[PDB]
């Protein structure tokens, strides 16, 4: 599934990451707007052999079992599978485990790298939530 920019924010919204560990709804956006252009079926093979999957890029290598990313964890206890689901459950999940693992979002590069300091409220600017 591909969603829209303010069908996400409301799905998010829903599923509590709302400034889950402080940070704010649009953060949230603008890190699925680059991690996935906001595709649930996104996927990216790692230089490590980890695989990044859903609209949070969530990685193999701690975060769920794809079978094929040898000395990996499953902290989310979910098959990577899940997170490609039109339902983001999953995703939501396991990102509230993955930003209270100590470095809050900067988890996600692409969230340091294009959101971090941005005026990320544009991301939900318009959004009826
Ligand atoms: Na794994």
Not at 37 to 52: K, L, P
């Amino acid at each position: 599934k591909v969603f829209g920019r303010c069908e996400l924010a409301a799905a998010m919204k829903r599923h509590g990451l709302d400034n889950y560990r402080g940070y704010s709804l649009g953060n949230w956006v603008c890190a699925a707007k680059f991690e996935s252009n906001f595709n649930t079926q996104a996927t990216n093979r790692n230089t490590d052999g980890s695989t990044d999957y859903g609209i949070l890029q969530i990685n193999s290598r701690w975060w769920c079992n794809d079978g094929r990313t040898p000395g990996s964890r499953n902290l989310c206890n979910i098959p990577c599978s899940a997170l490609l689901s039109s339902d983001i459950t999953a995703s939501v999940n396991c990102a509230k485990k993955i930003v209270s693992d100590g470095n809050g979002m900067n988890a996600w590069v692409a969230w340091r790298n294009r959101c971090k300091g941005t005026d990320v409220q544009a991301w939900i600017r318009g959004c009826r939530l």
